[PDB]
Amino acid sequence: SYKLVCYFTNWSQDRQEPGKFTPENIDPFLCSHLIYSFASIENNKVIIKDKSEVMLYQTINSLKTKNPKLKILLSIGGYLFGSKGFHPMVDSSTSRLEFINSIILFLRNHNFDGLDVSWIYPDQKENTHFTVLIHELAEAFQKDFTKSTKERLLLTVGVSAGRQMIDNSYQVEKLAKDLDFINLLSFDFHGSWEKPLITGHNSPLSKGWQDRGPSSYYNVEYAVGYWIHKGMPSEKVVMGIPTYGHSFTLASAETTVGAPASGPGAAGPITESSGFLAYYEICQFLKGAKITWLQDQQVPYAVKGNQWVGYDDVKSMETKVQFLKNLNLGGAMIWSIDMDDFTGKSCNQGPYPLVQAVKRSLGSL
């Protein structure tokens, strides 16, 4: 039994085609779990800020009628929300209790199966707050189940794949008791924010030939091994796989991993954010590009003109699924299905080429 946990986002609705996504684009049988990104916190209570909020509820109810086994979770956190978003809610047990009670009511009222807490990232400063918040949610969800005729609300967390951040942020053995599973954020290993500013892959499975010492932690295999080492049962690790890539503008003629970059890559036409591209943008980028498969890191990168893009393709999906099966992981998580070529129109490999390849690979005996 493997999970396929699929994040989708509430900002993809604002994009033009072929990136214009709403919950109606969701195939109810594509994933085992869907996670809505992201809720907000107002007056210490959970809400959803989304012009299409009430239509989301319609889709939730429709999806769960079509596939009664489907679980749909609500996520709070994400990069933009940061640590600031969790204040003032986390500042006392009183304000945290307001929040936890709001969560139970909201999830039940709106037919959600659970909560994902994706705090990006606690670090030293918020380690205690994150830990207590998770512990209090877990306890409250259990108490609520003790009294309910309904299923216990699930509790998951999106967590760092970086060793140092993991060490600083988490009390892993406690997290292993409190969480149903972790959504391991095994991507954003490299990108245009790095100093020195050199090319590197978003989500390498394995270490680079040039990696030594601390740089040898910056890959998926290491991250998964580290979480397990720290006490997370392998079956509670749901390994994140990205459907976006990180891009660089090259500073010289050199086009290899670790070549100098002047900055992020050119923004994609649809996502309009220099430094990343959705898969449906990558399929356009690849026309006229030279693609290299890294034998050391087991992932591709492509170069065209002065642009360098490290991304994940169908070969990477099948490779990463074989790896997670070999390590007895709980499944795969996707960030995010609304950046796969969900329409099928860009890549000409049918709808959701990456996620279908994950599903097919997971299901293959």
Ligand X SMILES: CC(=O)N[C@@H]1[C@@H](O)[C@H](O[C@@H]2O[C@H](CO)[C@@H](O)[C@H](O)[C@H]2NC(C)=O)[C@@H](CO)O[C@H]1O
Question: Of 188 and 312, which has the nearer Cβ to ligand X?
Answer: 188
* Structural contact between residues 312 and 241, judged by C-beta atoms closer than 8 angstroms: yes
Site membership for ligand X, residue 279 (CB under 6 A): no
CA distance linking residue 109 with residue 302, whole number of Å: 46
Residue 285, annotated ligand binder? no
Residue 112, annotated ligand binder? no
Question: Of 2 and 279, which has the nearer Cβ to ligand X?
Answer: 279
For ligand X, the binding residue among 86, 189, 276, 308 (CB under 6 A) is 276
Number of residues that bind ligand X (CB under 6 A): 14
Question: Of 144 and 242, which has the nearer Cβ to ligand X?
Answer: 242
For ligand X, the binding residue among 122, 158, 264, 353 (CB under 6 A) is 158
Site membership for ligand X, residue 335 (CB under 6 A): yes
How many beta carbons lie within 10 A of that of residue 337, not counting itself?
A: 25
Site membership for ligand X, residue 285 (CB under 6 A): no
Taking the complex as a whole, the smallest distance from the CB of residue 187 to ligand X amounts, in Å, to: 6
Q: Which residues 204-223 are close enough to bind ligand X by CB under 6 A?
A: none
Site membership for ligand X, residue 185 (CB under 6 A): yes
CA 50 to mean position of chain CA atoms = 20
CA distance linking residue 345 with residue 283, whole number of Å: 10
Taking the complex as a whole, the smallest distance from the CB of residue 276 to ligand X amounts, in Å, to: 4
Residue 57, annotated ligand binder? no
Q: Which residues 4-43 are close enough to bind ligand X by CB under 6 A?
A: 7
Build a one-symbol-per-residue string for 103-122: x at contacts with ligand X by CB under 6 A, - elsewhere: ---------------x-x--
Build a one-symbol-per-residue string for 236-275: x at contacts with ligand X by CB under 6 A, - elsewhere: --------x-------------------------------
Q: Give the binding range for ligand X (CB under 6 A) out of 74-82, 98-106, 125-133, 349-357.
A: 74-82
Site membership for ligand X, residue 79 (CB under 6 A): yes
Build a one-symbol-per-residue string for 286-325: x at contacts with ligand X by CB under 6 A, - elsewhere: ----------------------------------------
SS (H, E, C) the chain: CCEEEEEEECCHHHCCCCCCCCHHHCCCCCCCEEEEEEEEEECCEEECCCCCHHHHHHHHHHHHHHCCCCEEEEEEECCCCCCHHHCCHHHCHHHHHHHHHHHHHHHHHCCCCEEEEECCCCHHHHHHHHHHHHHHHHHHHHHHHHCCCCCCCEEEEEEECCHHHHHHHCCHHHHHHHCCEEEEECCCCCCCCCCCCECCCCCCCCCCCCCCHHHHHCCHHHHHHHHHHCCCCHHHEEEEEECEEEEEEECCCCCCCCCEEEEECCCCCCCCCCCEEEHHHHHHHCCCCEEEEECCCCEEEEEECCEEEECCCHHHHHHHHHHHHHCCCCEEEEECHHHCCCCCCCCCCCCCHHHHHHHHHHHCC
For ligand X, the binding residue among 42, 47, 58, 80 (CB under 6 A) is 80
Residue 244, annotated ligand binder? no
Q: Give the binding range for ligand X (CB under 6 A) out of 73-81, 133-141, 299-307, 316-324.
A: 73-81
Residues annotated within a binding site: 50-51, 77-80, 121, 185-188, 335
Q: Which residues bind ligand X (CB under 6 A)?
A: 7, 77-80, 118, 120, 158, 185, 188, 244, 276, 335-336
